[PDB]
Design a protein around this ligand. Structure first.
Ligand SMILES: Nc1ncnc2c1ncn2[C@@H]1O[C@H](COP(=O)(O)O)[C@@H](O)[C@H]1O
Length: 365
């Protein structure tokens, strides 16, 4: 039997969890022993885990836990923590892409005789990433995009979309976005068209699902993927759409999707751009119209146009935190088949690939 120990997150406002009560129940049904730290910040109530069969333990107790427990969490270790890491860990460690102090992160493992299985690079047998948050990133990005567009119909340009807060469940989010949307329509606003780039993937599907659920029909959604962008930008369709949602991270030096010249047009319709995969450290940002990474407490940034109506960007890197419960359920269920192979992790390719990758980065230190 494998023992997993779900550590409490400490990163500010991180309410997601790598295992949910549901995935815990499912692992227990397979003979796992599951410990769950009593986490202040989690969107899940600790009673949920208890009722699932988890053994509840104090927050931070992983640090003194027996060597044989596999420690599982989402976020990287606090850069401040210096003690050797003696356990096998499953987490996003953020030390494989030459991040600052990456060697020190790994030295903690080396000194400890611990092992990292990094969630960012966990790969199935067909070479695809096992678990990520793209669907809910798209769903939340579409939600905020519609909210921003609606807001613009009912408020003056000197006001911006107010601070946003996570929702306890998807229905609650949809109810609020629908309310805002219908209010905007009731003013006689032309029904908006929404252009999505990367429409066919998980992120794109998430955005589309939100749009559908708030009453936006396919007739008003322009679903673009590789074929549509292959002609090369800039695309006139972007300023012509009311809302533009970008659902694919692109960092190689190609022609941009849009630019200030194209946006500086009194006939532009576009009001709101949601760059779901925004990363201001992108070496070749194909939507070169913002430099600010916006955040929940100030979710939009002005695009400084010289003609046309007020245009704003949403460039939040934490969109899945808008719905931490569902984000966690999707993530943990995507990860579940791999977790079920942990008893055979010495031979199961998903885990062997991860150990090998860890070993290779440790060798560079
Ligand atoms: N340059 C591009 N233009 C438009 N769509 C793209 C481009 N590159 C990748 N995609 C699509 O983006 C989606 C990414 O899917 P996912 O990683 O599941 O969110 C897939 O449907 C890809 O085909």
């Amino acid at each position: 039997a494998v023992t997993l120990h779900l550590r409490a997150e400490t990163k500010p406002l991180e309410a997601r969890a790598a295992l949910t009560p549901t995935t815990v129940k499912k692992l227990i049904a397979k003979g796992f022993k599951i410990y769950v730290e009593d986490s202040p910040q989690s969107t899940f109530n600790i009673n949920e885990y208890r009722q699932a069969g988890a053994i509840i333990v104090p927050a931070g107790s992983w640090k003194t836990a027996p060597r044989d427990r596999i420690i599982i969490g989402l976020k990287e270790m606090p850069e401040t923590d210096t003690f050797p890491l003696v356990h096998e860990h499953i987490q996003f460690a953020h030390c494989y892409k030459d991040q600052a102090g990456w060697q020190n992160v790994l030295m903690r493992f080396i000194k400890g005789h611990g092992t990292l299985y990094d969630l960012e690079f966990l790969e199935n047998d067909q070479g695809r990433r096992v678990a990520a948050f793209g669907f809910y990133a798209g769903f939340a990005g579409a939600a905020l995009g519609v909210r921003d567009w609606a807001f613009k119909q009912t408020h003056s340009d000197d006001e911006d979309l107010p601070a946003v807060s996570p929702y306890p469940n998807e229905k609650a989010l949809v109810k609020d976005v629908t309310k805002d949307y219908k209010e905007a329509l009731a003013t006689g606003a032309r029904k908006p068209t929404v252009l999505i780039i990367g429409a066919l993937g998980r992120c794109g599907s998430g955005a589309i699902d939100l749009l559908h659920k708030v009453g936006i029909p396919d007739a008003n959604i322009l679903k673009w993927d590789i074929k549509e962008t292959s002609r090369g930008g800039p695309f006139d369709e972007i300023p012509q759409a009311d809302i533009f949602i970008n659902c694919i991270y692109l960092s190689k030096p190609i022609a941009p999707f849009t630019n200030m010249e194209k946006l500086n047009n009194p006939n532009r319709r576009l009001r709101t751009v949601v760059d779901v995969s925004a990363d201001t450290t992108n070496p070749h940002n194909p939507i070169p119209i913002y430099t600010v990474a916006t955040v929940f407490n100030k979710p939009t940034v002005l695009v400084p146009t010289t003609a046309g109506p007020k245009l704003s960007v949403i460039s939040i890197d934490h969109l899945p935190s808008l719905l931490p419960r569902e984000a966690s359920e999707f993530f943990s269920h995507d990860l579940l088949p791999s977790l079920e192979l942990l008893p055979q992790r010495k031979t199961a390719p998903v885990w062997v690939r991860a150990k090998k990758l860890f070993d290779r980065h440790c060798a560079r230190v």
